[PDB]
Amino acid sequence: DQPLAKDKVALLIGNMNYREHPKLKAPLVDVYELTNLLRQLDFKVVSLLDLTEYEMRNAVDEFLLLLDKGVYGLLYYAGHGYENFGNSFMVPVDAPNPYRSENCLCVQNILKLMQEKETGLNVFLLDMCRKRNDYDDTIPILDALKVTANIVFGYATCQGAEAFEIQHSGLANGIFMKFLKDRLLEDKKITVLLDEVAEDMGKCHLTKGKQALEIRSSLSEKRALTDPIQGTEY
């Protein structure tokens, strides 16, 4: 009756040095912090910065190869992003200006690939803006996903809105990680943990009325990032 993970695997990407878009600063520190925390929780973590489209697709293929039945998979992305028709896209550092969906990675496609590996848990922490891309002509018509009841999204912000870091950030985390880092070690279902983070963020004066954590979850079982890995000693 303690839920267990077959393994715990994470991919973390922070994109900052954009060639054709405004540069960001905080993804480095955000990625560094979440790497440390997830290693404390016994994840195998790949953590990568300033990825071109090609490097992003390679990194997710490598991450996919580490997933299998019952494995807890987590993806964290800090950098530019957008959202068209409910699909979220991550923008690589070599994106042209303007750019379309074909220059970017679609998070929903990654989730489909993860479900094909029969993971026990799928977590996406998307620390990026979610406004429309006007130049993106195209339409999804993606296939419906299976009902696996094990999917949690923690979006740094709401659809059509922006996610933030502190101007000339230096050492400061972006807003999402500022609050996430103080709760991530808790031994609570990831859904509930993210809900507490949503509440903490709501006390932040800088972002009132412009950024709010959105949780989207179909996770039915009481799964947590602290769950022990099967066959080790807890």
């Binding site: 922006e162 870091e165 950030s169 412009k210």
Partner: peptide
């Protein structure tokens, strides 16, 4: 703030 700076947006992402």
């Amino acid at each position: 703030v700076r947006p992402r």
